Design a protein around this nucleic acid. Structure first.
Ligand SMILES: [Mg+2]
Ligand SMILES: [Mg+2]
Ligand SMILES: [Mg+2]
Ligand SMILES: [Mg+2]
Ligand SMILES: [Mg+2]
Ligand SMILES: [Mg+2]
Ligand SMILES: [Mg+2]
Ligand SMILES: [Mg+2]
Ligand SMILES: [Mg+2]
Ligand SMILES: [Mg+2]
Ligand SMILES: [Mg+2]
Ligand SMILES: [Mg+2]
Ligand SMILES: [Mg+2]
Ligand SMILES: [Mg+2]
Ligand SMILES: [Mg+2]
Ligand SMILES: [Mg+2]
Ligand SMILES: [Mg+2]
Ligand SMILES: [Mg+2]
Ligand SMILES: [Mg+2]
Ligand SMILES: [Mg+2]
Ligand SMILES: [Mg+2]
Ligand SMILES: [Mg+2]
Ligand SMILES: [Mg+2]
Ligand SMILES: [Mg+2]
Ligand SMILES: [Mg+2]
Ligand SMILES: [Mg+2]
Ligand SMILES: [Mg+2]
Ligand SMILES: [Mg+2]
Ligand SMILES: [Mg+2]
Ligand SMILES: [Mg+2]
Ligand SMILES: [Mg+2]
Ligand SMILES: [Mg+2]
Ligand SMILES: [Mg+2]
Ligand SMILES: [Mg+2]
Ligand SMILES: [Mg+2]
Ligand SMILES: [Mg+2]
Ligand SMILES: [Mg+2]
Ligand SMILES: [Mg+2]
Ligand SMILES: [Mg+2]
Ligand SMILES: [Mg+2]
Ligand SMILES: [Mg+2]
Ligand SMILES: [Mg+2]
Ligand SMILES: [Mg+2]
Ligand SMILES: [Mg+2]
Ligand SMILES: [Mg+2]
Ligand SMILES: [Mg+2]
Ligand SMILES: [Mg+2]
Ligand SMILES: [Mg+2]
Ligand SMILES: [Mg+2]
Ligand SMILES: [Mg+2]
Ligand SMILES: [Mg+2]
Ligand SMILES: [Mg+2]
Ligand SMILES: [Mg+2]
Ligand SMILES: [Mg+2]
Ligand SMILES: [Mg+2]
Ligand SMILES: [Mg+2]
Ligand SMILES: [Mg+2]
Ligand SMILES: [Mg+2]
Ligand SMILES: [Mg+2]
Ligand SMILES: [Mg+2]
Ligand SMILES: [Mg+2]
Ligand SMILES: [Mg+2]
Ligand SMILES: [Mg+2]
Ligand SMILES: [Mg+2]
Ligand SMILES: [Mg+2]
Ligand SMILES: [Mg+2]
Ligand SMILES: [Mg+2]
Ligand SMILES: [Mg+2]
Ligand SMILES: [Mg+2]
Ligand SMILES: [Mg+2]
Ligand SMILES: [Mg+2]
Ligand SMILES: [Mg+2]
Ligand SMILES: [Mg+2]
Ligand SMILES: [Mg+2]
Ligand SMILES: [Mg+2]
Ligand SMILES: [Mg+2]
Ligand SMILES: [Mg+2]
Ligand SMILES: [Mg+2]
Ligand SMILES: [Mg+2]
Ligand SMILES: [Mg+2]
Ligand SMILES: [Mg+2]
Ligand SMILES: [Mg+2]
Ligand SMILES: [Mg+2]
Ligand SMILES: [Mg+2]
Ligand SMILES: [Mg+2]
Ligand SMILES: [Mg+2]
Ligand SMILES: [Mg+2]
Ligand SMILES: [Mg+2]
Ligand SMILES: [Mg+2]
Ligand SMILES: [Mg+2]
Ligand SMILES: [Mg+2]
Ligand SMILES: [Mg+2]
Ligand SMILES: [Mg+2]
Ligand SMILES: [Mg+2]
Ligand SMILES: [Mg+2]
Ligand SMILES: [Mg+2]
Ligand SMILES: [Mg+2]
Ligand SMILES: [Mg+2]
Ligand SMILES: [Zn+2]
Lengths: 59, 50
RNA sequence: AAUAAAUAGUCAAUUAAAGCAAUACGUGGUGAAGUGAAACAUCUCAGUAGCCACAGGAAAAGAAAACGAAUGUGAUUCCGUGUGUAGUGGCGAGCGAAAGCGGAACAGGCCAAACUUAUCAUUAGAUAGGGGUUGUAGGGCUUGCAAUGUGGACUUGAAAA
RNA sequence: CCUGAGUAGCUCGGAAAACGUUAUUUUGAGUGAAUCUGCCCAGACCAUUGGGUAAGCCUAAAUACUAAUUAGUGACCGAUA
RNA sequence: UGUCAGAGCACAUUAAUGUGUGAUGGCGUGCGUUUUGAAGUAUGAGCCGGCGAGUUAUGAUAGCAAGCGUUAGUUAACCAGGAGAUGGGGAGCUGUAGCGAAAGCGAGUUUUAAAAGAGCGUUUGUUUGUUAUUAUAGACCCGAAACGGGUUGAGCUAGUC
RNA sequence: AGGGGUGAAAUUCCAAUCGAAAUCCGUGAUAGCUGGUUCUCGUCGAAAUAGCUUUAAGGCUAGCGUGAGAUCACAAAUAAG
RNA sequence: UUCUCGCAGUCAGACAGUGGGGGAUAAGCUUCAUUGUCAAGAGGGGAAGAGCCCAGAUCAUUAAAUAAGGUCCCCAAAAUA
RNA sequence: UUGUGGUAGACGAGCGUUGUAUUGGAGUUGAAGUCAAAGCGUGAGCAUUGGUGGAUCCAAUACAAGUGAGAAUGCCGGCA
RNA sequence: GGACUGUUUAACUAAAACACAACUCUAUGCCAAACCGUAAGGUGAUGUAUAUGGGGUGACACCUGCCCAGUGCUGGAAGGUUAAAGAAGGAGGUUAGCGCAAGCGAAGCUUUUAACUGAAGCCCCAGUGAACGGCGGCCGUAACUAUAACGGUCCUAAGGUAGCGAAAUUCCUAGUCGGGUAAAUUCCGUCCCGCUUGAAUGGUGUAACCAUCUCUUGACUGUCUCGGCUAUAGACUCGGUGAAAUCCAGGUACGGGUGAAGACACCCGUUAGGCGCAACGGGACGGAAAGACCCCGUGAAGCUUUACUGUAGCUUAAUAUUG
RNA sequence: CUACCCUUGGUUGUGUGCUGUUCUAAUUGGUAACUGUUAUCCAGUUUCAAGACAGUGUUAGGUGGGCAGUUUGACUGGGGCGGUCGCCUCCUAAAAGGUAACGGAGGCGUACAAAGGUACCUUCAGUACGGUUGGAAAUCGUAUGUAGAGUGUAAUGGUGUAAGGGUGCUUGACUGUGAGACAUACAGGUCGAACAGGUGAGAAAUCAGGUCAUAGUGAUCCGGUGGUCCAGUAUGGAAUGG
């Protein structure tokens, strides 16, 4: 099996197996979002349980 | 969509630190507000930047 | 022969080539499409199938104008790992090494040019020999010492297993 | 004194390499160098440092395969196999 | 078109409230498929016998079990050995320290002027055997109209000579 | 002589076949579509819903099932206030 | 019926009562909310009926009491006023 | 004591076929096959006897599968 | 309707379709245009504008009207825009060097940009219809009514001319009228608001011809009123050989109802001794063909175009052969 | 008088191409002749005709269904046609929330340097009466009136000492964050206490992380711009990235 080249470059793993990710809606069209929204989307997050199983076998 | 947004940049480090809205048709004069600057860590004049 | 010479052409003698197959391996030229991307054109399929040419008992490759970042390795080939890593991708489907390390085997040789010899209406810029084969540069020019060996990818024979 | 020239480079279209063309390799068209204080390379490029000697040739072994000859084997088949 | 009761008839056994037939009474619209719903005026099979569809190779995850264990665990290629178990082979792979895009720091680290706050960490291993699922391969079996590449056909027929 | 031929032209004819022969090969093409998938017993036992989908006969996640483990009460059910 | 992990199937539903939308207070119509059954559930009543009523089949018994429903005959079971 | 309708599906426990490895055993005084019968099991299934048959087969514990046919307008053979 | 004789879908369409003699347009000066191939080579043609290729129409007779706006084709002065390529220069990277730093900075190479030159084509200007094609409305108006010769106005490139017309064309429409008949959605002639006829995708006539279409009529007849008879070969019976599709197992009634909504099989009734033979087709949603119609599939194939992306060919320029 | 820099013209002179001639030796010929050769091809030698043209190779424009590979959506009381596809408000929606139909009505893809923030002051529309232009209705005074007024907007909800109107000062329409919740398949969305920095209003308490609230919006990839305490393929830069 080959690791998907798109699964990597977008999902980093951690010590306990959580898959770190970046928030979307942070590429353009900045004036259409509030500074609260922008500063909340700047921080990183983890995949939800609904996607953890699908990303585990993808990596 | 229409583009009524404008950028406000500091006048000491010449850094752009704010994104606001402006009506070019109604308001003809450039904005000259005074806002907080992350670099200078103080309040300083921010002017409209193209 | 045209056309004087000379070539084209014609004839004779000698030596090789033709072809086949092993439903298999090698090299080179040419080279798709079904399919996947849940459509499709970049892409994939795939340099695969097929077509053709040349072999050989294997073929191909091969002795650094190299790897590559070090007080480093020192032809080519094949196996494991490095790793599904660095990367490359309408960054989509996908594709995917080169170093290094551990192993199988191990082998390095030879021409051109200089310089020189002999001969060609010697206009040689040509033929046949000696000299040379490189990188911590080599060789030639002139002048000496030490050498008669060790080893080959090497010919004929004889003997033995 | 000699050390491989329409050659290495460069431009225009392609390709090989994992790479969808790009440092390295190759070429259809055009142009075109230098000679150990020389030339090429270390992913655009320049300088320092270092590595290597292109444009000539040959090369056993480990590697790939079994139509065939001899011996033999099979938790392979036993006439719809 | 059978089943539960049931006379009469004829026999005698894997000795068993026995076996063969069944006047008569009660009840009773097949089997698979696909559908909300099939006795089906939907579908598939005339009958019998044989054959006929979840595999293999390489990896990932999880359950169960065994070996070895806290500076652990385990070898791949290859060599010897019976086409062996195995011995040599520690190249490597997983775990042992994490955080950050990265230089970097380190039981801390990223963000930030911040040590405040927040995110991630401040521990529970490895190699095999078996089972389940999954990825690449044709991947449970059968079925297209098609597409591309090569060859064979003008003895029928159409044209021309 | 077949992404070709021939056609006083009809999509005619090209070996009882022609909107583009016959045969072999890529090939076991692909099919979200039909059909089929073979021994037994025991425990438990659904859904036909929401969102997205060039999606509507398909797919992913959530909802409902099953196996293992944890949570004993503060968790979840049945009645009264 | 909450939390974690492994494996799913399901995305065509149907009817009856109740409250509505579309239709015409038509449809065994179509689209919702809710209570039930069928789907995936036999038995008894409805003469015959997937969805209505009574209920939930472990096997055997030629035992007894009952639910819906019924007691002239078919067909088990009644009499008084 | 509470239970035991059941499709898709999940989980658990078993039967049967062929062969191999270890043990033991039967067989021309008759093995497999094959037919019949009034047997034993909760189920796959398992025996006993007799006829035919003429040379291999059985039991236990493990292991490996081309391992289970009623349907595919399924293929082949035979017969209605 | 086609001029004709002919040709055509082997195996459902022989015709009004194709072809044909004839007309016209266009290209072609010969190594001709066109065509097969990749090229050689070849057809055209051992021909030479009275010749060859292609488009359209289809004897013969009379005619073929208007529009060059759009598209196509041909030609054109200059002018504007435009590729490759060449090219004056410009901007950076590096560092010899200058400078306390900072910074500046020669040549060499190297990255990139570039005025300007640069054909055809396009924009633009004319011609071209037997080239692709197109060729209108509204309002008022004459001394009975009716209608409008006539006048006004909008738009277009120009608004359909002749001829023919309820047509193989007419929706309304079985249009009105006349003829044919006792009676005529068909037929013949005529009328014209021709929704939407019309002049080389030709218009209108036309003698002869047609296994063409359509209507009336004489003779003629079993086409019919209306059915009947005869003879053979079958069918039927006997002797011999001996299939076929179909088929879950069958011992296979009718009426009303029910049910997946049209029952041999279910519920309630009625009828019916067992089994053949000859008949005829009501049913078994009878048999044969995994519906050709409809829909679905991110199915296939053929064809079309100013759908997209490409490409053979044709044409223009730079460069090499190239003075 | 001696020098440098602009507009324009002539001159001997070189450097480039641009159209225009002439020439032949490259090259071409399906002109003719001879020879190989008993030979229509081919080759050689001429002759004639062209001629640096043409043809051919490479590069680059134009035309090009002649040819090829594909695309040409979904919902739908069957399809085609018509209509719609995202977000917001009300009803259907059955007094928590949620709930469909090609059911019934409407809007949005913004606006405001003030319509934001703060401090202070202040409170309808309409109607009645009285008054030049002036009129049914402009403005003034008094009274009445409990929202029919305003709150930028489509509706709903809210709000009459408010969230409506006016004035003064300002830019919090801040920086780094963020415990805890709402709603959700995911992706995303919504509210937010509180902390640190530095500000605005106000005497202070306090308020200010855009508006009375709900529509005013688009993921990823790719490339561009500004800043930068990161990388810079031997080293120093640069290129190129983060
Ligand atoms: Mg393809
Ligand atoms: Mg595809
Ligand atoms: Mg697909
Ligand atoms: Mg060799
Ligand atoms: Mg180079
Ligand atoms: Mg490649
Ligand atoms: Mg050197
Ligand atoms: Mg470098
Ligand atoms: Mg050299
Ligand atoms: Mg055989
Ligand atoms: Mg046989
Ligand atoms: Mg009975
Ligand atoms: Mg019955
Ligand atoms: Mg079955
Ligand atoms: Mg059905
Ligand atoms: Mg149905
Ligand atoms: Mg029936
Ligand atoms: Mg049917
Ligand atoms: Mg079917
Ligand atoms: Mg059948
Ligand atoms: Mg069978
Ligand atoms: Mg395991
Ligand atoms: Mg070992
Ligand atoms: Mg912390
Ligand atoms: Mg362990
Ligand atoms: Mg013939
Ligand atoms: Mg094709
Ligand atoms: Mg046709
Ligand atoms: Mg035929
Ligand atoms: Mg198949
Ligand atoms: Mg498909
Ligand atoms: Mg149960
Ligand atoms: Mg349900
Ligand atoms: Mg529901
Ligand atoms: Mg589907
Ligand atoms: Mg699910
Ligand atoms: Mg429903
Ligand atoms: Mg529904
Ligand atoms: Mg209802
Ligand atoms: Mg209603
Ligand atoms: Mg209703
Ligand atoms: Mg219904
Ligand atoms: Mg079902
Ligand atoms: Mg029932
Ligand atoms: Mg009943
Ligand atoms: Mg029970
Ligand atoms: Mg009782
Ligand atoms: Mg009772
Ligand atoms: Mg009784
Ligand atoms: Mg059960
Ligand atoms: Mg056995
Ligand atoms: Mg026996
Ligand atoms: Mg089998
Ligand atoms: Mg005719
Ligand atoms: Mg004729
Ligand atoms: Mg015919
Ligand atoms: Mg005929
Ligand atoms: Mg030619
Ligand atoms: Mg000729
Ligand atoms: Mg004609
Ligand atoms: Mg005509
Ligand atoms: Mg005309
Ligand atoms: Mg004109
Ligand atoms: Mg022109
Ligand atoms: Mg007229
Ligand atoms: Mg007339
Ligand atoms: Mg007529
Ligand atoms: Mg009449
Ligand atoms: Mg008629
Ligand atoms: Mg008439
Ligand atoms: Mg016409
Ligand atoms: Mg015409
Ligand atoms: Mg006429
Ligand atoms: Mg005829
Ligand atoms: Mg007879
Ligand atoms: Mg007979
Ligand atoms: Mg009924
Ligand atoms: Mg069908
Ligand atoms: Mg398609
Ligand atoms: Mg396709
Ligand atoms: Mg040219
Ligand atoms: Mg010739
Ligand atoms: Mg030329
Ligand atoms: Mg071109
Ligand atoms: Mg095109
Ligand atoms: Mg096409
Ligand atoms: Mg394709
Ligand atoms: Mg549709
Ligand atoms: Mg419809
Ligand atoms: Mg309908
Ligand atoms: Mg539409
Ligand atoms: Mg509510
Ligand atoms: Mg409610
Ligand atoms: Mg409002
Ligand atoms: Mg204010
Ligand atoms: Mg306000
Ligand atoms: Mg892109
Ligand atoms: Mg560097
Ligand atoms: Zn600043």
């Amino acid at each position: 099996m080959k690791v998907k080249s798109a699964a990597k470059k977008r999902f980093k793993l951690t010590k306990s197996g959580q898959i770190k990710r970046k928030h979307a809606y942070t590429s353009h069209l900045a004036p259409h979002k509030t500074t609260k929204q922008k500063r909340h989307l700047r921080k990183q997050g983890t995949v939800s349980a609904s996607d953890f199983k699908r990303i585990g076998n993808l990596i | 969509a229409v583009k009524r947004s404008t950028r406000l940049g500091c006048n000491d480090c010449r850094e752009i630190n704010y994104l606001t809205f402006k009506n070019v048709k109604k308001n003809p004069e450039k904005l000259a507000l005074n806002k907080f600057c992350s670099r200078c860590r103080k309040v300083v004049v921010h002017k409209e930047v193209k």
